[PDB]
Amino acid sequence: GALEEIAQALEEIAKALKKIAWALKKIAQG
Amino acid sequence: GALEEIAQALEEIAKALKKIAWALKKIAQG
Amino acid sequence: GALEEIAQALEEIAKALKKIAWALKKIAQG
Amino acid sequence: GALEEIAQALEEIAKALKKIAWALKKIAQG
Amino acid sequence: GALEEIAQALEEIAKALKKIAWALKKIAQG
Amino acid sequence: GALEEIAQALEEIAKALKKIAWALKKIAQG
């Protein structure tokens, strides 16, 4: 579906952003 | 410090994007 | 419903981001 | 200016999330 | 129309994340 | 260092989010 493809892409963006956020936390703490 | 705050904000933003994706899926399912 | 529940969560994230924004302004100012 | 720039960006994201929440309620209400 | 408002809000979030990326680069290269 | 990598990744996330928003706008338009 059209909106399902948009949502899938958004979910991948969000998972990538969560990883970046964790990496930045660890750099910050260190 | 500031970078740890920024990391938390990126995590909040990722959470919002994931929820927006689920909202789009529910809209499609309607 | 499902979309209204997401809307509430997004409003809470928005408040969290505004709190972090003020924390960053405080760090910059001080 | 870096931290203040990020704070301003987070505030704009917060506004955008409130806009999305409002749109979701409008969709939900039909 | 509400879905278009959601898309416009996502565009604003993307611009704001670009500004956050730019600010973090400035901190990194400082 | 790491923060430069994080900023570049965030810029890539923002570019992708812009494309997602544009696709959603076109869906919303018909």
Side-chain angles (χ1 to χ4, degrees), chain C residues 2-14 16-17:
Chain C
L3 310 182
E4 292 173 275
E5 187 167 324
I6 294 160
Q8 294 294 308
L10 294 180
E11 292 173 354
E12 298 305 288
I13 292 164
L17 295 181

Side-chain angles (χ1 to χ4, degrees), chain E residues 4 6-7 9-10 13-14 16-17 20-24:
Chain E
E4 191 162 344
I6 292 169
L10 292 178
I13 293 165
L17 294 172
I20 293 170
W22 172 89
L24 292 176

Side-chain angles (χ1 to χ4, degrees), chain A residues 6-7 9-11 13-14 16-17 20-25 27-28:
Chain A
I6 298 299
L10 260 180
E11 269 152 22
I13 292 307
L17 191 49
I20 296 301
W22 182 87
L24 179 57
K25 177 196 96 163
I27 293 289

Side-chain angles (χ1 to χ4, degrees), chain A residues 17 20-22 24-25 28, chain B residues 1-3 5-10 12-14, chain C residues 17 20-21 23-25 27, chain D residues 2-7 9-10, chain E residues 17 20-21 23-24 27, chain F residues 3 6 10:
Chain A
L17 191 49
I20 296 301
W22 182 87
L24 179 57
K25 177 196 96 163
Chain B
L3 290 184
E5 295 275 2
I6 293 157
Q8 184 59 39
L10 297 185
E12 297 299 331
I13 292 156
Chain C
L17 295 181
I20 294 155
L24 294 174
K25 285 175 193 180
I27 291 164
Chain D
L3 293 188
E4 301 100 316
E5 185 67 30
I6 296 172
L10 295 181
Chain E
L17 294 172
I20 293 170
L24 292 176
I27 296 165
Chain F
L3 189 57
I6 284 152
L10 188 60

